[PDB]
Motif scaffolding. Structure first.
Motif, PDB file in Angstrom:
ATOM      1  N   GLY A   1      22.060  32.557  30.546  1.00 21.88           N
ATOM      2  CA  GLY A   1      22.070  33.215  29.201  1.00 21.88           C
ATOM      3  C   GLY A   1      23.416  33.806  28.925  1.00 21.88           C
ATOM      4  O   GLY A   1      23.766  33.601  27.652  1.00 21.88           O
ATOM      5  N   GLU A   2      24.100  34.353  29.841  1.00 23.74           N
ATOM      6  CA  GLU A   2      25.415  35.148  29.626  1.00 23.74           C
ATOM      7  C   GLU A   2      26.190  33.706  29.338  1.00 23.74           C
ATOM      8  O   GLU A   2      27.071  33.587  28.243  1.00 23.74           O
ATOM      9  N   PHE A   3      26.281  32.622  29.968  1.00 20.59           N
ATOM     10  CA  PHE A   3      26.995  31.378  29.762  1.00 20.59           C
ATOM     11  C   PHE A   3      26.494  30.671  28.530  1.00 20.59           C
ATOM     12  O   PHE A   3      27.246  30.387  27.652  1.00 20.59           O
ATOM     13  N   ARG A   4      25.197  30.664  27.949  1.00 20.67           N
ATOM     14  CA  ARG A   4      24.879  30.145  26.815  1.00 20.67           C
ATOM     15  C   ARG A   4      25.424  30.868  25.783  1.00 20.67           C
ATOM     16  O   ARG A   4      25.614  30.355  24.654  1.00 20.67           O
ATOM     17  N   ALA A   5      25.516  32.473  25.724  1.00 22.31           N
ATOM     18  CA  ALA A   5      25.768  33.019  24.719  1.00 22.31           C
ATOM     19  C   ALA A   5      27.274  32.754  24.358  1.00 22.31           C
ATOM     20  O   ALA A   5      27.916  33.167  23.266  1.00 22.31           O
ATOM     21  N   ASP A   6      28.165  32.349  25.370  1.00 23.52           N
ATOM     22  CA  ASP A   6      29.406  32.342  25.343  1.00 23.52           C
ATOM     23  C   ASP A   6      29.693  31.301  24.275  1.00 23.52           C
ATOM     24  O   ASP A   6      29.588  29.999  24.335  1.00 23.52           O
ATOM     25  N   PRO A   7      30.566  31.622  23.157  1.00 25.43           N
ATOM     26  CA  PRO A   7      30.891  30.608  22.023  1.00 25.43           C
ATOM     27  C   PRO A   7      32.222  29.840  22.329  1.00 25.43           C
ATOM     28  O   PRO A   7      32.778  29.027  21.488  1.00 25.43           O
ATOM     29  N   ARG A   8      32.506  30.079  23.474  1.00 24.59           N
ATOM     30  CA  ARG A   8      33.772  29.325  23.872  1.00 24.59           C
ATOM     31  C   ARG A   8      33.631  27.691  24.076  1.00 24.59           C
ATOM     32  O   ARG A   8      32.920  27.251  24.779  1.00 24.59           O
ATOM     33  N   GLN A   9      34.380  27.012  23.290  1.00 26.98           N
ATOM     34  CA  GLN A   9      34.224  25.392  23.503  1.00 26.98           C
ATOM     35  C   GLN A   9      34.752  24.772  24.732  1.00 26.98           C
ATOM     36  O   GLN A   9      33.942  23.958  25.071  1.00 26.98           O
ATOM     37  N   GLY A  10      35.595  25.301  25.258  1.00 23.08           N
ATOM     38  CA  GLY A  10      36.054  24.954  26.649  1.00 23.08           C
ATOM     39  C   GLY A  10      35.296  25.620  27.718  1.00 23.08           C
ATOM     40  O   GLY A  10      35.852  25.255  28.788  1.00 23.08           O
ATOM     41  N   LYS A  11      34.199  26.481  27.798  1.00 23.02           N
ATOM     42  CA  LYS A  11      33.787  27.045  28.869  1.00 23.02           C
ATOM     43  C   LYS A  11      33.164  26.162  29.965  1.00 23.02           C
ATOM     44  O   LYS A  11      33.054  24.999  29.445  1.00 23.02           O
ATOM     45  N   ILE A  12      33.606  26.578  31.211  1.00 26.77           N
ATOM     46  CA  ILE A  12      32.921  25.578  32.289  1.00 26.77           C
ATOM     47  C   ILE A  12      31.736  26.428  33.271  1.00 26.77           C
ATOM     48  O   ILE A  12      31.823  27.759  33.443  1.00 26.77           O
ATOM     49  N   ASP A  13      30.820  25.644  33.753  1.00 27.54           N
ATOM     50  CA  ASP A  13      29.613  26.031  34.431  1.00 27.54           C
ATOM     51  C   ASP A  13      29.865  25.712  35.817  1.00 27.54           C
ATOM     52  O   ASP A  13      29.168  24.761  36.137  1.00 27.54           O
ATOM     53  N   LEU A  14      30.186  26.570  36.897  1.00 21.55           N
ATOM     54  CA  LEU A  14      30.276  26.133  38.262  1.00 21.55           C
ATOM     55  C   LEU A  14      28.976  27.174  38.911  1.00 21.55           C
ATOM     56  O   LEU A  14      29.018  26.976  40.090  1.00 21.55           O
ATOM     57  N   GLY A  15      28.237  27.568  38.331  1.00 20.20           N
ATOM     58  CA  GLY A  15      27.184  28.399  38.802  1.00 20.20           C
ATOM     59  C   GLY A  15      25.862  27.564  39.027  1.00 20.20           C
ATOM     60  O   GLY A  15      24.868  27.942  39.982  1.00 20.20           O
ATOM     61  N   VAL A  16      25.902  26.311  38.724  1.00 20.61           N
ATOM     62  CA  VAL A  16      24.665  25.351  38.799  1.00 20.61           C
ATOM     63  C   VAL A  16      24.437  25.233  40.264  1.00 20.61           C
ATOM     64  O   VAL A  16      25.467  25.344  41.230  1.00 20.61           O
ATOM     65  N   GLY A  17      23.171  25.146  40.491  1.00 23.04           N
ATOM     66  CA  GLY A  17      22.723  25.205  41.935  1.00 23.04           C
ATOM     67  C   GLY A  17      22.286  23.600  42.364  1.00 23.04           C
ATOM     68  O   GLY A  17      21.627  23.679  43.579  1.00 23.04           O
ATOM     69  N   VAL A  18      22.363  22.989  41.863  1.00 24.15           N
ATOM     70  CA  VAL A  18      21.568  21.502  41.877  1.00 24.15           C
ATOM     71  C   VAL A  18      22.809  20.414  41.501  1.00 24.15           C
ATOM     72  O   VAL A  18      23.849  20.897  41.189  1.00 24.15           O
ATOM     73  N   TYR A  19      22.695  19.351  41.880  1.00 24.08           N
ATOM     74  CA  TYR A  19      23.566  18.271  41.692  1.00 24.08           C
ATOM     75  C   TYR A  19      23.718  17.681  40.481  1.00 24.08           C
ATOM     76  O   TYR A  19      22.615  17.693  39.821  1.00 24.08           O
ATOM     77  N   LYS A  20      24.873  17.598  39.879  1.00 34.38           N
ATOM     78  CA  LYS A  20      25.151  17.245  38.587  1.00 34.38           C
ATOM     79  C   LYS A  20      26.058  15.918  38.543  1.00 34.38           C
ATOM     80  O   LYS A  20      27.153  16.231  39.332  1.00 34.38           O
ATOM     81  N   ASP A  21      25.950  14.841  38.089  1.00 33.22           N
ATOM     82  CA  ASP A  21      26.778  13.806  38.157  1.00 33.22           C
ATOM     83  C   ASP A  21      28.126  14.188  36.927  1.00 33.22           C
ATOM     84  O   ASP A  21      28.223  15.140  36.497  1.00 33.22           O
ATOM     85  N   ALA A  22      28.985  13.034  36.898  1.00 32.98           N
ATOM     86  CA  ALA A  22      30.168  13.189  36.080  1.00 32.98           C
ATOM     87  C   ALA A  22      29.932  13.539  34.684  1.00 32.98           C
ATOM     88  O   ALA A  22      30.708  14.183  33.936  1.00 32.98           O
ATOM     89  N   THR A  23      28.688  13.261  34.088  1.00 31.78           N
ATOM     90  CA  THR A  23      28.321  13.566  32.629  1.00 31.78           C
ATOM     91  C   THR A  23      27.482  14.919  32.698  1.00 31.78           C
ATOM     92  O   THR A  23      27.262  15.265  31.566  1.00 31.78           O
ATOM     93  N   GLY A  24      27.341  15.587  33.963  1.00 31.97           N
ATOM     94  CA  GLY A  24      26.492  16.906  33.739  1.00 31.97           C
ATOM     95  C   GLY A  24      25.101  16.335  33.796  1.00 31.97           C
ATOM     96  O   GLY A  24      24.511  17.349  33.330  1.00 31.97           O
TER      97      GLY A  24
END
Ligand code: PLP
Ligand code: PLP
Ligand code: 4TB
Ligand code: 4TB
Lengths: 394, 388
Positions: free
Chosen positions: A18-41
């Motif tokens: 929710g905090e991440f989603r609220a972030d209006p930053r165009q270049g924000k990055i999310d390293l909190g994910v707990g599952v595997y994500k490929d190059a495209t996310g």
């Protein structure tokens, strides 16, 4: 009556999202994910798995109730995938569970059933769900030193000292590989020493194996577990299929109970089946049938192992890069542990203040304990993370 | 340490199948004329659609998917669904919904007792024993008339107290086959309201009695009168997805404040038990229910099953009257659902299984779906020969 219910704390994952989603930053990055994500996310459905579901759709003629503790094909295939040739069927009890978490919960219920005065020893730190379930069960919990905040490695001497205080009948929870959240793991020699301490204390080992195939390889990742199995008479192994098979939502896992005698085994299987019965009757079939199909069908199995290895190799290369970029910017080794860690997670050793500063100044998000998901990095995000780590002064 | 484990008692109903010319009238699963438990058309179609539409299998909702939760609430309560005060929780089958129901109630009331029907599904008592909950029974089955002993039921239920939980089967009573009428349901609602007892409704056969909507009639009446109610639903039988393990727990509250409480505590219960609930079966259910064409075929297929069994019951009663001329076994026609308890005693039951090869649960519970044109005359003869 329900009004008397106490307010239970949310899943937290949501708050982070929710905090991440609220972030209006165009270049924000999310390293909190707990599952595997490929190059495209994305978190794709493995090829072999999609092939098993198509086959199942064409072969299944009914959906009637099946085995109470799982289907023989699944139990057998899982024990072989985990214990290999060392699989002593005569003394092994198996239980199909609702994911690795279900396996952990059942294991705890089993042990306590055998020893009411059970105490659990967990690493410092460990997967929060461990403590959550144990607290909910009202079992006493002790911690054993594990992560070294200064070197980002295993404080083995500390672990030995603390584990030396376990008494006969206590339980010691060990991550088989790819320690979550740290990423710092034990060498095969350290496993041998842990084994000696366990024989000496008479403590029961509970192995949380949810990442087999993400560290050094399928076989390599089970090495530590196999060493424990061959030297300790009683061992409990809670395995997951959510990650190394990419079927998270299917809820597929299993509890393996290695016993000293065949009589003891018959006892354990009876108690495990009884446990499933008293909780939800029968375990979920779909995910477990996918797994047994992949493993028993040569074609599929070969494709699964190949896809899994591609994933492992990929993340490892992501580790090499991040550590290299960090080597260049720091002009020192310091962050070398990043390439030494195994699993899809790594604890950077950043303080909460630094984590907050990284998010505010660089838009990068991670768990408050500085845990980052390697899979979320790429050729474009690595330079940014590196710079942020150095800039905030970690 | 594991050597200390004490041996545990087996599930009688499931053990029954262990000992299995051979006529299986045991386990409560539907079977067609050729003794097979088929997969329903809509269910199969849903899986195929699912195979093409799903792109990921990442972790999802801890309480189930919104679509599933909504479809289920609507299916059960219809227009009596006040989402503002209803909490939903996807579970591992109806049994899972049951367990979570008892855990939730116990968190709210550490001093709760559970009232169950005499007789009732054996798994109800085993789970309660396991949890260590006090169990009291209320009269329900009339041994001689094979109907409901309503006066006895009312008397016993009146003894309940505020905080106690009353477990009622929503329809198709397992193992008797005897069911309450809507007029009896209203009276029960009266007693519950007065006593302040929380009713837990076990709904596992909606669609097998008199119809989808009709079978939920009782549950909807209680939900409209009693401010707080728990409903444990199984999709195992009405969707024919037994092994997928899918059902859900509905927690109806007097207000949104308490609703948020229950919802939070329900999710927490899944997290601490197995983390997330199984997705496949719940996805099939929601797919079928939200796809008009699929829902339509499922309703039709369930309807067919319903009327088919109804006919078999009529055949049973008939053939049996040709063997007596008495209306003694008339109850077979009155009973609604998959089961029917004959007045047979354990000795008689054994004589049947041994000198007749027909295996039924040790209390005379028979799964009418197991009978057919070829075996009805045989079974009719069997129970006549054994004299019951
Ligand atoms: C993922 C995980 C589990 C089990 O996950 P399930 O989704 O229940 O299969 C158990 N332990 C650890 C450390 C994990 O990361
Ligand atoms: C079938 C049934 C249930 C639940 O079955 P699940 O397979 O756990 O979905 C609960 N109560 C009764 C009376 C039943 O017949
Ligand atoms: O990020 C991790 O620790 C792995 C995610 C696994 C789970 C999170 C919540 C229930 S199971
Ligand atoms: O036959 C019955 O009574 C119900 C179906 C069989 C089951 C036994 C335990 C969970 S479901």
């Amino acid at each position: 009556m329900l009004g008397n219910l106490k307010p239970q704390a949310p899943d937290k994952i949501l708050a982070l999202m929710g905090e991440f989603r609220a972030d209006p930053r165009q270049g924000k990055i999310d390293l909190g994910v707990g599952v595997y994500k490929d190059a495209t996310g994305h978190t794709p459905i493995m090829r072999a798995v999609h092939a098993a579901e198509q086959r199942m759709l064409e072969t299944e003629t009914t959906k009637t109730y099946a085995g109470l503790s799982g289907e023989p094909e699944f139990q057998k295939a899982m024990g072989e995938l985990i214990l290999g040739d060392g699989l002593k069927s005569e003394t092994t009890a198996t239980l199909a569970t609702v994911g690795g978490t279900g396996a952990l919960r059942q294991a705890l219920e089993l042990a306590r059933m055998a020893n009411p005065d059970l105490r659990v020893f967990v690493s410092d730190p460990t997967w929060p769900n461990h403590v959550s379930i144990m607290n909910f069960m009202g079992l006493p919990v002790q911690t054993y030193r594990y992560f070294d905040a200064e070197t980002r490695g295993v404080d083995f001497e500390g672990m030995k000292a603390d584990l030396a205080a376990a008494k006969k009948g206590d339980m010691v929870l060990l991550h088989g590989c790819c320690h979550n959240p740290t990423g710092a793991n034990l060498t095969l020699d350290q496993w041998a020493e842990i084994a000696s301490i366990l024989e000496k204390t008479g403590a029961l080992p509970l192995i949380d194996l949810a990442y087999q195939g993400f560290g050094d390889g399928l076989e390599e990742d089970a090495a530590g577990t196999r060493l424990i199995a061959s030297r300790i008479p009683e061992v409990l192994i809670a395995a997951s299929c959510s990650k190394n098979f990419g079927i998270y939502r299917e809820r597929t896992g299993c509890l393996l109970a290695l016993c000293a005698d065949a009589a003891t085994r018959e006892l354990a299987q009876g108690a495990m089946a009884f446990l499933n019965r008293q909780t939800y009757s029968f375990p979920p079939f779909h995910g477990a049938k996918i797994v047994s199909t992949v493993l028993t069908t040569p074609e599929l199995r070969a494709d699964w192992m190949a896809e899994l290895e591609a994933v492992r190799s990929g993340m490892l290369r992501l580790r090499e890069q991040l550590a290299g970029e960090l080597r260049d910017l720091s002009g020192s080794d310091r962050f070398g542990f990043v390439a030494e860690h195994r699993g899809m997670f790594s604890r950077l050793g950043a303080t909460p203040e630094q984590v907050k500063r990284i998010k505010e100044e660089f838009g990068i998000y991670m768990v408050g304990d500085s845990r980052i998901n390697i899979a979320g990095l790429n050729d474009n995000t690595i330079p940014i993370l590196a710079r942020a780590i150095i800039e905030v002064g970690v």
